[PDB]
Amino acid sequence: TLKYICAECSSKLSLSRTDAVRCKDCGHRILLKARTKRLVQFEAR
Amino acid sequence: MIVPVRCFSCGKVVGDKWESYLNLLQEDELDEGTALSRLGLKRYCCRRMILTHVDLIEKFLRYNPLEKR
Amino acid sequence: TXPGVTXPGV
Amino acid sequence: SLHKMSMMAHRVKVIPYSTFRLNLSVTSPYNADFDGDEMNLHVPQSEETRAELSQL
Amino acid sequence: NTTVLADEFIAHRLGLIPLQSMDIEQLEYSRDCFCEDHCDKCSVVLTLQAFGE
Amino acid sequence: NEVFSRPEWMILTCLPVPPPPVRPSGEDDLTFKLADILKANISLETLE
Amino acid sequence: RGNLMGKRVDFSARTVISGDPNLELDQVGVPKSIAKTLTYPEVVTPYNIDRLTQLV
Amino acid sequence: FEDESAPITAEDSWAVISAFFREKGLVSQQLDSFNQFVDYTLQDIICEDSTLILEQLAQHTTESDNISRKYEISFGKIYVTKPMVNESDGVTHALYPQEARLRNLTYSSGLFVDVKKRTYEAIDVPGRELKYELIAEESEGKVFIGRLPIMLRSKNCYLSEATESDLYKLKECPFDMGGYFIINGSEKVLIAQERSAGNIVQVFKKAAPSPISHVAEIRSALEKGSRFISTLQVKLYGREGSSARTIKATLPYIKQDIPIVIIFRALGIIPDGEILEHICYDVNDWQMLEMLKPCVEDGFVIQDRETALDFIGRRGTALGIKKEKRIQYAKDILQKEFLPHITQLEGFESRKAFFLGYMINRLLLCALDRKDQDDRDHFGKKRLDLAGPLLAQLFKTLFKKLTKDIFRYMQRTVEEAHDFNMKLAINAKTITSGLKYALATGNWGERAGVSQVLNRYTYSSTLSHLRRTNTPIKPRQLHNTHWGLVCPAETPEGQACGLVKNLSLMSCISVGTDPMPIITFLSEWGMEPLEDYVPHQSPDATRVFVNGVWHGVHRNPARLMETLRTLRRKGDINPEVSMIRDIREKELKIFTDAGRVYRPLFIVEDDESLGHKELKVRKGHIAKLMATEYQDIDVEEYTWSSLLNEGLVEYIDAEEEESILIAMQPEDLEPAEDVDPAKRIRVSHHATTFTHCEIHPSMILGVAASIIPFPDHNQSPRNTYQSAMGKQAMGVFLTNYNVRMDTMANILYYPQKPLGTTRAMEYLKFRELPAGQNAIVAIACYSGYNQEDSMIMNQSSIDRGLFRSLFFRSYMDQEKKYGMSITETFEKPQRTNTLRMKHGTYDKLDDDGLIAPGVRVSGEDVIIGKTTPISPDEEELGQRTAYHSKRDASTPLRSTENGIVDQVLVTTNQDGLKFVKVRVRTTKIPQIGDKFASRHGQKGTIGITYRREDMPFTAEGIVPDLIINPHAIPSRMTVAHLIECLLSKVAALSGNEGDASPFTDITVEGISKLLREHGYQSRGFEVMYNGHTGKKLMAQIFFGPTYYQRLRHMVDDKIHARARGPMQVLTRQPVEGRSRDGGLRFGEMERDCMIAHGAASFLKERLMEASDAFRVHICGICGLMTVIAKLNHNQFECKGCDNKIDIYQIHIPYAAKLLFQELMAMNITPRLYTDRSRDF
RNA sequence: CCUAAGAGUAC
DNA sequence: TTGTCATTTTGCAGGTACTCTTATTCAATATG
Ligand SMILES: [Mg+2]
Ligand SMILES: [Zn+2]
Ligand SMILES: [Zn+2]
Ligand SMILES: [Zn+2]
Ligand SMILES: [Zn+2]
After folding, report:
1. Closest CA–CA distance from residue D12 to any residue of chain H (Å)
2. How far is the CA of H950 from the centre of ligand 1 (A)?
């Protein structure tokens, strides 16, 4: 599903809607959404 | 944050003269003025570009990465 | 006074 | 806007930047500098208001 | 970009990198080239791939 | 004035209730005050 | 005092001011975005049907 | 150097300052006050009172149960834990600040108290005195009474003992100084509240109309008691020409001003001679006796203590006491209400009588024109309540509420004979909610603005906010006593000018200590007790005051002061204690209370070896301090406390500063007596009796003013402007800004440390976290586009990164439990089954309703998708069906803002409901209208930007980054700007750093000589060529580097226009604010200007068509708007008037209609008529 | 949405 | 058949625009 990263473990997790937001590796309750896969364009100016 | 690529006023490339500047300051125990003159920064625009830079990126690198691979 | 600084008076 | 000269009718000149631009000589009645002063613009919405604004 | 710098920060720094332009007259402006966004007649493509191992 | 303001009209016997446009709604403060006035009026009427 | 003697009005803009030696005394420079926001209602007349149609 | 005892130089003092800031820090007062509150004040609050006794009498109808019980509850020691957080599942774990900030928690630690419950029983025998005994049911057992918020880096915080590496691990910036609370994830700082000191007698003259001429008052208060303010006033009735000059005292809870002699007789001093002895200490002072005779003449009617007590009771405002108990009532007034700060017990009547005599003595001295009336603005008479005392009084009130609740619960459960439980008794929500409410909101109760959101725009801004003092409300003036304690030029320009102050760099606030050891020292060393003091036998006796309490007299004040100074200089007395000896007034005052503001100073002793006064500090101590600093960056450590404990430096506050002589610098003022004409003129004061020496004059400045280069070469308002404006400078506020979800953040791309730098700015970490850039500035009338404070910025320089910035904005959104199963849900709303969906595109939202980082977002786009359940089965609006069970509560991006989404953070709140934060990043590039300023108050906006080829250029091809108008210089007299430009040019050429410290011996002539040695014109002028034509400019241009700040006021955040938009629901007028697409205010005096212009139709159009035009119907019979108008059916009818053919329509502002309807609702008829009934 | 408070810009 | 003079109570409002952020909405005992 959608990917998140533990704010402390820096590990990758996949979360569904019904999943409680925790890191299975350590138990941290703060997660950051993963970087988008669609390309990003920047003007070098 | 990190050394600017070019001098703001004249546009001389100074982003490749930061590590050389630090090496001259540390290894050779040269004062700042002589080290700046050695690298070829003769106009005081470039001299203030390199002399007054604060390398904050080291501090940023101290924290653990948010996304670690 | 005033107000401020009624009147005086009133 | 302490006096009537601090509220005057100007002619629009459309310019490509995000600031109101005015002549230097008209800053004295407005008591205006360019150190961050903001100014206000009102547009008449009828021919009568437009005409009396331009003629008075 | 998992670094400590913002993406447009690095983009600006890259835009300030001087590149060889001895034969720049043989390249065409992107505005007057028939390609869609960029092609070989009007651009040069570089790739920066770095890892902190 | 004989027609527009007689002295006995300074005593309130009927309160004109303003329409909801005056006190638009979370009720307005005026609505709560009018509710309090009605409650007091009903209490006094029942006591009498 | 807060709604009758003075009130908030439509068709008004506010922004920072800058000086321009190349503007006339009675001219004011208006940002293009402000000019695109503020509008004037012009009655359709035989004398100005063409330009109003073009603006539409 | 080589000599260990050689005198120090002016350069050596910076080592001392370095040691000071190595031990204290910048926010030492906050942490010290909080540590004092936690370590000692909480225990004192708990132990004082808080012993609930409930005596349930026997109420014995029959003698079989004539037993009276007594339940008592006492509170023992208090334990404060490390900060921890609860959870929805009940799991409790350690909480760190960079988790509470993200999760909107409160960085608080639980409080527990050892509660001991005892019960006593006695036999209720009438007549016999009850005797209560233990039943051996002694139950004790800590209980949770609430949570105390903990400021960061305090002794009870996780970061107090953290190292730099640990701080990096915990996502905490090592440069962060702490001293603030985290309330609901927001950083709150307690502004130091200024107040007048207590227990000090102040005498003030009164105006001519008033009958009282002089008033002597004391704001009596006791620290270790009820902490209540009782104001005693002693007033001298009658003007100068009046004859009946009677002195009267305003006792508390008394309706009238009792004559003073009545009070003396009530206290127990009957004879007139003894009263006058208690008042006047000089027999020869016949003027005071003559002025005081009316008082004894007035009081001759009462010649007995009981009579005076009866008189006071008769004047007592209670009026509910019988005649014989009035004596007792008066006794209670004179014991527990009259001068509480002296004592609350009985048997100390003589002390209070002596203090009253002293107050009357001060009043008569002021009335006799022997002393001036007390200055209310004297900073030594002021106290700054820090976090400690504020939290202490708030917690005292809150715990009193809790213990009253405990007593009420105990009474309820014993009267109903139910079982007693401790958990059901205590309500930790009381303390927790009270503290959280007081810290979360500005108000301090159940004052305003006591707690403020910590300013995080720039590092210097944060430092200035953490050292800020506010005075509740000429008090706005900069007083003389403010020297070295508050910044001379750092204050807001608005209504708070002078009221809001900032601490000096080296100024500290005392935390308060126990005065018992000092009283014991005084008694041991020969202080005469006040009880057996007879002024006649000891005429020239120095009165000794401790915390405003006259404790006695001493006959040899010189030796006493010398030994007290020795004890304080070896650390036996706490150095915060201030001791003042007034020789002329023959007084000795010792202050140990909290809130006193002091500063450190060098100590100057006789130094018989050199035969002249010299500093106690020598080159050996400087060498040891340097060695310790070098080791920190193996020998014995030598810190600031080492200097303090060996009598090298001293802490002096304003009161003690009154009685000392200070040398400005050691090298010029200590030694006894062809000069450089470029140097400024200084004097030697022609006097050698100094007691102290300034560590450095530049330490009188605050945090913001220490950034100014050469502040002594500027006009003072310019320094004030820069002090207020550097807080708005843009830079790097913290190093860990990448892991903080702040609401707004601004970061420079390339911060540069100044070329012109001060010695004091390397303790403020300004060279590590700069907030500006060194721009090549030319002062020239180049094109006319930099007139009236405008500037010309180099477009090519902007293209290369000059003053470019990052801007982060964070949006927070929670899901809330509207009911048991009415939980909100973060999701992507669908137009099929959602109401009130915004016009912004929802496409960028993925399944969970949160835009993944990296996606570009423009204005009005939805970034957080949230829906809430509603009641189904409703049909309306044309397209509302039973499927629309969800109402949209999404959060769109700001209308005027756009950028790249940087980061999104999902977590659980305190209640356990998921909530998110979305931080979006954009880049601000300087453009026309952005505000920039030098460090000398030279603000200005960018007029125009020229490319490099169009700018004027020197012979070396250097073009300026900025061009500023010459006309900004002469009127503003910012000479420091020019001097700093010259110094920066020299520093850039030579590679050194320009020492722009204020009071150094750095002159323009020397800088010019160095610049000429570098091959440039000595005064900084350069021959420049016009960019357009290449021809030489006839005038040479002042040219060189200068440090500029980019201010927070950008034009893109201020531009606003509105043709037509949302209207206010009540008045049907445009809404307020550019954030709401509001309208501009056409105020009263704009209308006055338009009236002066004579444009009536334009005014009508502004007030009616532009804002609110309403058509309303009235009738010609009654002018009221009570006309029922069915427009479609074309039927107009005013009920009551019973007319249908006499109706008019008028166009009036909707505000006017609302005003008329409100007048009608207020029983007023504003009848509107359309024809004249009277001739003009 | 309302209210309150605080900070700030130009006078 | 008229002046007299000498204490005690009487009401208050503070410039013009404009920007931003933060918190909070009565808690708790009591009856349906
Ligand atoms: Mg101005
Ligand atoms: Zn983890
Ligand atoms: Zn250069
Ligand atoms: Zn191409
Ligand atoms: Zn009618």
Report:
1. 15
2. 28
